[PDB]
């Protein structure tokens, strides 16, 4: 019957190149959540409002698709919004390490949760949130990888 | 609305999914039950597909291969097992499938399945590629290994469903 995956990540902007993967992931799942980590360990560009609220925009156009942000173990969360699927894009090799030991853990602490990987497209294989951030605060061109609400958001927060 | 449209496959909400499963399976081990397993939790239907001409000379035959699989996953009523001489992108659309599943056991590997995804994502579009991490019981088993440590006497029982230990056995001696 149902599936309801999660989508987590902070999300520092949302980027192109998430925006792929949660369409992808839409398109295979009956519910998916963006689930938007209230509480990074690095402290964000952009808080918890302002990247939910961006999300919610790029997205709005996808029918079964919804954003949340969440400050609890994800195995509480997925549990408390009955979600029996985990999505993750996996960009870098070094992520891949990572991201199969939370995977481990996230077995131990919620069986019933599968972890699905997707890779990116080859046009956002390159990009992440941190790396945009980098060339846009030097004043390289990034409008390519961002949606045009998140892209004026970043400018605003570098002028 | 079928009269105005067919309906496309993207930002529409979920759509029907069919999952294959590709690999030699020589022979199916407890790691592929489990990623094939998972994969049928989460999508309508999976075709186990056993590729019938792999490059190194498989100690089953596809017959083999396919009979010991077919048994091995009879308990799930939305997998089926079939044998495929061609690409796995060619078989997919033949299945009209959508989705491709691949289990993802070594850092080494990686690289080699993000390059296959996009000849893949080249050949049909439509087709998407999803990775599962093997459980951490199966994570460093494969059929070679359990072949060579079988060959040599090692106890592999708890790696293998009963059907395929037999038969392995009988291979050796």
Same mark, same amino acid.
């Given at each position: 019957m149902?599936?309801?995956?999660?989508?987590?990540?902070t999300?520092?902007?949302?980027?192109?190149?998430?925006?792929d993967?949660?369409?992808?992931?839409?398109?295979?799942?009956?519910?998916?959540?963006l689930?938007?980590?209230?509480?990074?360990?690095?402290?964000?560009?952009?808080?918890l409002?302002?990247?939910?609220?961006?999300?919610?925009?790029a997205?709005?156009?996808?029918?079964?698709?919804?954003?949340?942000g969440?400050?609890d173990?994800?195995a509480?969360?997925?549990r408390a919004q009955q979600?029996?699927?985990?999505?993750?894009?996996?960009?870098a090799?070094?992520?891949?390490?990572?991201?199969?030991? =939370?995977?481990?853990?996230?077995?131990?602490?919620?069986?019933? =949760?599968?972890?699905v990987?997707?890779?990116?497209?080859?046009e956002?294989?390159?990009?992440?949130?941190?790396?945009?951030? $980098?060339?846009?605060?030097?004043?390289g061109?990034?409008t390519?990888?961002?949606?045009?609400?998140?892209?004026?958001?970043?400018? $605003?927060?570098?002028?």
């Amino acid at each position: 019957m149902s599936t309801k995956a999660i989508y987590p990540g902070t999300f520092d902007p949302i980027t192109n190149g998430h925006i792929d993967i949660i369409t992808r992931a839409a398109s295979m799942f009956d519910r998916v959540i963006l689930a938007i980590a209230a509480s990074p360990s690095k402290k964000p560009m952009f808080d918890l409002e302002e990247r939910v609220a961006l999300a919610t925009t790029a997205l709005q156009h996808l029918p079964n698709v919804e954003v949340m942000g969440f400050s609890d173990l994800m195995a509480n969360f997925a549990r408390a919004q009955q979600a029996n699927i985990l999505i993750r894009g996996l960009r870098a090799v070094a992520d891949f390490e990572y991201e199969m030991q =939370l995977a481990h853990m996230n077995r131990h602490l919620m069986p019933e =949760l599968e972890s699905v990987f997707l890779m990116p497209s080859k046009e956002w294989s390159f990009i992440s949130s941190s790396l945009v951030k $980098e060339v846009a605060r030097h004043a390289g061109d990034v409008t390519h990888f961002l949606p045009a609400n998140v892209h004026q958001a970043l400018m $605003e927060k570098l002028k």
